[PDB]
Amino acid sequence: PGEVVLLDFAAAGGELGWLTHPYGKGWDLMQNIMNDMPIYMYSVCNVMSGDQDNWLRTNWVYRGEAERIFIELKFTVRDCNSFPGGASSCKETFNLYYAESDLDYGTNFQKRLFTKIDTIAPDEITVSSDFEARHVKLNVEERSVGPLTRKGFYLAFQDIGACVALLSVRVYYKK
């Protein structure tokens, strides 16, 4: 009721383009069409492929009146035991960051300007029998940041070698 939404990935219906770095090697915009409605997600799953440091940054969001924003994530993480021999290079977490700016820097992404909010861990991993039966465990996690002081902000997601699908990213403030 009293919430004002500033960013909503799933409501955009695949139309938000989030920046990825390194380009073409990590996070990817995916779709699933097994229901009446298409489902979109940002996914990465380079679990047995050497060290990973894959970044995904949102579009610029004008904060307006918001002083404190609340960030709600919905996501799946596959069990590292789904991947044979990967008990060393496979992870089940990813990291959430943000940055404030008075202008949209566009494709200029400088990870050095971003502040870490938290490591995001799944309450429930999706095990192989789930995945193979098309029955994922969707996690829901919320964080907040503030006071905000510039005109707008970005969120970013860092993958360190997990098998993660981001299905919902909703940012709001309370009026």
Partner: peptide, 11 residues
């Protein structure tokens, strides 16, 4: 490996 079942790149 796929992070999500029956998902394909969207572009």
């Amino acid at each position: 490996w796929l992070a999500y079942p029956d998902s394909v790149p969207y572009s």
